[PDB]
Amino acid sequence: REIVHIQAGQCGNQIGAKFWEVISDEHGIDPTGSYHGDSDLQLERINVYYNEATGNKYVPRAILVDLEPGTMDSVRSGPFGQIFRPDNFVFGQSGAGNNWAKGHYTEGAELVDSVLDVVRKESESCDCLQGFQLTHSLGGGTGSGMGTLLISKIREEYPDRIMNTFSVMPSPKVSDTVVEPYNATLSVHQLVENTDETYCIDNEALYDICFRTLKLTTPTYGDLNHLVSATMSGVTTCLRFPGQLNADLRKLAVNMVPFPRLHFFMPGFAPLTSQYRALTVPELTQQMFDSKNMMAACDPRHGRYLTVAAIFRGRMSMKEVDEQMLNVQNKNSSYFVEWIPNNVKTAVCDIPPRGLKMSATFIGNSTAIQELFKRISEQFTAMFRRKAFLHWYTGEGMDEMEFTEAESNMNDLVSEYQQYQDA
Amino acid sequence: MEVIELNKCTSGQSFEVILKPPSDPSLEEIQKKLEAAEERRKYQEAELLKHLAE
Amino acid sequence: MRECISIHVGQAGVQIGNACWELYCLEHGIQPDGQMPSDKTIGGGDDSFNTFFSETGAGKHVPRAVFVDLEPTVIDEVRTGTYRQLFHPEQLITGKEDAANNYARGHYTIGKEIIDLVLDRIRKLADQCTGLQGFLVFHSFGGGTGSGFTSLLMERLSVDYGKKSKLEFSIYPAPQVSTAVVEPYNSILTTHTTLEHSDCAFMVDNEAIYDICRRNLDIERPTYTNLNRLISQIVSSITASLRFDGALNVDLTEFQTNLVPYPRIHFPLATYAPVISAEKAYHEQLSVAEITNACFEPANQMVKCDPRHGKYMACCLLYRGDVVPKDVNAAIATIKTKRSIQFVDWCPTGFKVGINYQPPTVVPGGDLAKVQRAVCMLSNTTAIAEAWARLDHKFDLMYAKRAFVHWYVGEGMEEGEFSEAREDMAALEKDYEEVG
Amino acid sequence: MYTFVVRDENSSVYAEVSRLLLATGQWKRLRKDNPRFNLMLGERNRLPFGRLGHEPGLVQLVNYYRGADKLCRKASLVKLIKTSPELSESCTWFPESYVIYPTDEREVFLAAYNGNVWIAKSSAGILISSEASELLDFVHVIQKYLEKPLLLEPGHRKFDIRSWVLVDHLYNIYLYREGVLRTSSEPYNSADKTCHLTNHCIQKYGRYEEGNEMFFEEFNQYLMDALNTTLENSILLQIKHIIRSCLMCIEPAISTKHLHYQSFQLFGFDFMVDEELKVWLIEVNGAPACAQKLYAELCQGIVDVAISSVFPLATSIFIKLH
Ligand SMILES: Nc1nc2c(ncn2[C@@H]2O[C@H](COP(=O)(O)OP(=O)(O)OP(=O)(O)O)[C@@H](O)[C@H]2O)c(=O)[nH]1
Ligand SMILES: Nc1ncnc2c1ncn2[C@@H]1O[C@H](COP(=O)(O)OP(=O)(O)CP(=O)(O)O)[C@@H](O)[C@H]1O
Ligand SMILES: Nc1cc(C(F)(F)F)c(-c2cc(N3CCOCC3)nc(N3CCOCC3)n2)cn1
Ligand SMILES: Nc1nc2c(ncn2[C@@H]2O[C@H](COP(=O)(O)OP(=O)(O)O)[C@@H](O)[C@H]2O)c(=O)[nH]1
Ligand SMILES: [Ca+2]
Ligand SMILES: [Ca+2]
Ligand SMILES: [Mg+2]
Ligand SMILES: [Mg+2]
Ligand SMILES: [Mg+2]
């Protein structure tokens, strides 16, 4: 049950590269694609993310996409850079100028067919493809505009497959250009329609975690990406390792998404330490439900959980885990909807991440995520009411009506979350 | 309390104790329902592809 | 001699089937390679164990069994495991991708494409029967395949084998052992569609098995292996009458005659005792009176409910080991004066008793201690309706908001099937109420 | 902390219990339909006992015993006493009673009938008569009316005694040390419902004791002054005997020992005393109210004995009947 991974644009490729570093290390794959692990658990489900080539070589089922060569040259020169299939680097030269229209309609449209050629070749050598995961940001041009164009084309060619994204949401605190709210608003509408699960990663929350909790005076994008790659490893654990769970992409979406448009998840991770100290189960459980450990800058106490997955990694007492999960649900009794019985799942995997004896990953489908879309909507409207910076988009053939519709659609999404928060 | 119907073999025995006395869809229809669901899936997919074509 | 065909559907059905056939082989002296030295008739026969096992000319005893699952990982363990040589490859059927915890996907989308293959493989087993009795069907309520494909299969079995009995062993969902959030939906949908096709169904609540493993086996965190080896003991005691010489419950029809006076109300409660830890250093053996008394303790039931607040329609006691009728009757006498046992007015207040002198077999290296005597009580009591009420309430909570319904409509199921199935369950709950 | 739900808004006792729980700071009240509670203060009718005790890792306790209605309905009580061998048709402390439908006992009542005053009543409507035909013309119970009650002086007036009994989850039987006499203000006339029915509403008067309620200290002092005996000796021994007999009779049917959820329940036993100082059981109430001045004490006792015993917090007012 193979998964095809796609990483698009600068953010998408830098976070994607770290993800492949982390899980190659977990599966025992060295920078040359040779396996040197010591546990058969590492190979049991290796084909979910890796093809097997002769010579005992494992090659990520990964497609690297960008409209300029720079970031993918850095990937190819990076650690584990030689592990990727050279044919799977698909790139242009023009760039997308942080412009959703260039990614979606002009520059990106010139390149998308060759990306689909690589997707098709990867899918054709799948015994039984589960679906796709895309890593990208929403605030630039290639990941945002060409990324969502890609999702639309993949849906057209594979309408019965699952599509997941790890989507980095822009924040003025960690911003490259002023047009990020435009690019994000245009993309969010695409994601509402064309993904089954979107992990919402807010650069504001990542920065605040690095500065306030990790005691990093000057966080870099690399520091932010350490947190993301750790979270992506934790959320895919149940696909990658022979869990008793027997989970695939569709089962995850069925259990997490009660209404088709409400599929935007707040992820979280624990521990986050500024260390050799042993973490007890009560500490792990308390931290993973703490707003300060969550990676969308939304307060869960401002909304209600529809569904929650909590994934524990390492050797620990299951009985202690259950006692803490019950205790934390008591402390948050007001914050779980009561019309979805038993909507908090506990999963456990024996293999711990590197450098930790135990950890926990949190995935919440919370109505508080509406705060994230409200922030974007506000920043969008402050500029759009004066039509500021629009010429960059109308110069690529877009009309103002398409902005009005995208804003209306996101405000609708906010209304739907509020509807179920008060149910 | 009366014991009745006591049967014995080399493997075991059985009996009854009384404490007190008292006081489909056809093949064609299944095929039809399966085909109706398939057609609804086909209609929903055709609406999707029309939407993507727009 | 009349053959029985076992059909195991989805992960729970298959893994429980593995545990059962392992135990059967130990009870009958069949080695994992299929050889059975005690069987002096080579290549055939009509002994009682032949109801469950056919024979090849080479002396191999082959289960009359089909394993079906929509993804291959569970059945692949059968194909490579200890008892791999026992089954013919045609008996192990796998698809490519599963039903994703979705009744509609198992019933309509994927079921439509594999049902004809499954029936062909069953027909091949049926063709080797001289007098097929019918089917024993193992499955979960909660899984997409166990709920959705099973109900499709039961419908087609009623078409293709109209005069044959069909018994179910059904795993009822409990959040303590990994459930999907939509398992109440799947359970109601499959019960509605299967109700008229099943003659007698034994529900096993994973919550009860889980708690028995915690309390009596002192297992902190029961695994599926722990659960299934206990379930297989109970299944074996229920089916022992079909596989050994005897006069009680000797064919599938007798289960209906003895346990089910009303067709829709066909869910007998199973209670089992004793369950004793094999790691227990010092253990005193329990008498006939003590194990019979334990049959009226909710803590030993396969479904947690309170029979004191229902009425009995029928009651069967199935003993294994050192038990003679005189002790059974003495124990029953004492129990009647001390327990709230109320029968419906149109049924006799009585018990059908079966004794098999062979004590229960335990898997070497298992968690269950060998005991000198054990008993399984099968009682049709209205108290089991509590399990339906619990499930219908969870269904109602979610369906009022239409939560997760789009996953089912997306597979071509109509929304009206939800309320149709729920209304059938409402009438079922009312039926129990009128009787009780 | 601990969690509870309230499903009977009309209960004075448990509104006070809920008040105390919240005032401990270690209990949180949830919405009525939240399944993740430790403690259910349930509705009087159709309480969903079948949904209790199935929440992973939650100890669940409810303030009603499933099956206790057998004791707390009039026809049920008659049937239980007649058909239970530990109580017997020869039961000496329960007035001769017959169940009559408008299983039926019309003929045996007519036989015994053939002092002949009976009272017809139901838990669903009260007629005291000396003639058999009038009662039948009027599920009901016909009970021998106690023609010679003990009459308080001055006033020549009837009364009944209410005892409060708490049965906890271990089936310990606790008799609250304070009972109430509910008196008639009118003089007793054996030759008008007000002098024959002691109910508070029917009387509501106040002339001899406030709200027609006399408590045990005054009643015991009266028994000493007028009859040279005590409340414990002449009456309370019989009351404790009757309470224990009733509750032990149904214990195997209702006990929650070895059940997946636990029950406790507060009961209201009502007694009559005749002029020979013999005590008669009249009825058992399954959802009693309390006397206004005793609410504080008994409700705190319920929290100490029935709730905190299962859910511990970070002299006894009860007599333990054993
Ligand atoms: N006792 C027991 N219960 C099981 C076992 N396997 C799964 N379950 C229960 O079965 C239900 C889940 O259904 P499964 O049988 O795994 O699903 P399936 O039939 O394979 O259907 P899909 O995987 O959705 O296609 C849950 O309630 C599980 O707890 C098992 O081996 N033993
Ligand atoms: N057999 C009997 N002999 C004499 N008096 C009787 C009697 N049965 C009932 N009574 C009188 O009738 C009054 C009310 O009768 P009953 O006990 O049936 O009403 P009730 O108990 O349902 C209201 P509550 O639940 O508050 O007690 C009692 O106070 C008692 O004085
Ligand atoms: N990344 C993940 C991981 C899991 C992970 F748990 F599998 F790891 C789940 C998840 C959640 C969940 N629930 C969400 C909250 O409501 C209850 C169900 N149930 C399940 N499964 C149940 C059925 O078997 C397969 C896994 N998985 C979701 N996303
Ligand atoms: N977390 C994280 N965010 C990034 C990274 N690089 C860029 N961003 C954010 O991504 C957005 C800019 O998009 P980018 O990927 O650089 O543009 P693209 O190449 O056109 O897709 C802004 O919101 C940046 O804050 C990164 O490496 N990590
Ligand atoms: Ca160009
Ligand atoms: Ca033979
Ligand atoms: Mg950039
Ligand atoms: Mg499965
Ligand atoms: Mg009353």
PDB file of C-alpha atoms in Angstrom, chain C residues 15 69 80 97 108 126 164 183 214 246 284 348 419:
ATOM      1  CA  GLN C  15      -7.757 -14.154  13.625  1.00  0.00           C
ATOM      2  CA  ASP C  69     -10.466 -10.525   3.821  1.00  0.00           C
ATOM      3  CA  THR C  80       3.060 -18.462   6.570  1.00  0.00           C
ATOM      4  CA  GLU C  97      -7.419  -2.894  -0.285  1.00  0.00           C
ATOM      5  CA  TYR C 108     -21.345  -2.201  -2.124  1.00  0.00           C
ATOM      6  CA  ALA C 126     -20.012 -27.595  -0.600  1.00  0.00           C
ATOM      7  CA  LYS C 164     -29.208 -24.428   5.082  1.00  0.00           C
ATOM      8  CA  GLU C 183     -18.428   1.129  14.532  1.00  0.00           C
ATOM      9  CA  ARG C 214      -7.563  -8.501  33.069  1.00  0.00           C
ATOM     10  CA  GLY C 246     -23.515 -36.745  21.662  1.00  0.00           C
ATOM     11  CA  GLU C 284      -7.834 -25.208  43.951  1.00  0.00           C
ATOM     12  CA  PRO C 348     -40.923 -24.303  30.542  1.00  0.00           C
ATOM     13  CA  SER C 419     -32.848   5.315   9.237  1.00  0.00           C
TER      14      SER C 419
END
